């Protein structure tokens, strides 16, 4: 079904590095050059106050829409990833349901300015205080800390491409029917990532990558906070949250 479902040669691994990097470059929601250029564009005290005065429901709605927009780009990244479209539909959905948010959390570090602890949001950079109306301070703080930690690694765009391919192609996700096929694709993407690091003298980052369970903890906290919000504003979720967001995080 795909070359990468079996043992790949060095030259095939080299091709895989190029294919993954190309898939990522074509499916960025935000260009790195744009994010870096916009760093001087920061929300004023007045603008921050405006976001803080928004109702909890209006802020949750906006943030769910922005997350859904990011997730759509991750779905396109998946579709372009060597071997992904050759997996069965059940496995494609299992991997995206479990991994789409994890990939967005990783992609976020590009939009995060470690210099002043701000993130690009609705056209300007703002600190975590911009999100205070959500009423999930702990989760926002944890996501900022995560982006801060990833920012300290100074990832290149190619490293992000290969690392996020692996975040998505995880053979341990519960529910995978063709687990052996996913294990082999994961093995080849792992080789592609480690080969690129070896070639660029960046193998030192391997021991510095987030631990096993860190991305899972942030994803579980998101679902928990959404369930709290849903109990408070059930019709906001039913009437005004994006259908894709609900399919991923509230079981439809």
């Amino acid at each position: 079904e795909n070359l990468y479902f079996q043992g790949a040669s060095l030259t095939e691994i080299e091709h895989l590095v190029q294919s993954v990097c190309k898939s990522y470059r074509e499916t960025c929601q935000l260009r790195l050059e744009d994010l870096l250029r916009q760093r001087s564009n920061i929300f004023s005290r007045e603008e921050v106050t405006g976001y803080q005065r928004k109702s909890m429901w209006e802020m949750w709605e906006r943030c769910a829409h922005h997350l859904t927009e990011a997730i759509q780009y991750v779905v396109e990244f998946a579709k372009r990833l060597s071997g992904f479209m050759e997996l069965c539909q059940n496995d494609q959905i299992v991997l995206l349901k479990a991994g789409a948010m994890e990939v967005v959390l990783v992609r976020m570090c590009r939009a995060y300015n470690a210099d002043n602890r701000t993130v690009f949001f609705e056209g300007k950079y703002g600190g975590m205080e911009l999100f205070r109306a959500l009423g999930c301070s702990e989760l926002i703080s944890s996501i900022f800390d995560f982006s801060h930690s990833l920012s300290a690694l100074h990832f290149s765009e190619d490293e992000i491409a290969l690392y996020t391919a692996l975040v998505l192609i995880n053979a341990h996700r519960p529910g995978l029917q063709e687990k052996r096929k996913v294990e082999q694709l994961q093995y080849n993407l792992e080789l592609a990532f480690h080969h690129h690091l070896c070639k660029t003298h960046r193998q030192s980052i391997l021991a510095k990558l987030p631990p096993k369970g860190k991305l899972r903890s942030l994803c579980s906290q998101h679902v928990e906070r959404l369930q709290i919000f849903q109990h408070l504003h059930p019709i906001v979720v039913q009437a005004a949250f994006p259908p894709l967001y609900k399919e991923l995080f509230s079981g439809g």
Partner: peptide, 10 residues
């Protein structure tokens, strides 16, 4: 419903 549509949309 959505994920199936996005995956099927070529």
């Amino acid at each position: 419903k959505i994920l199936h549509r996005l995956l099927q949309d070529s």
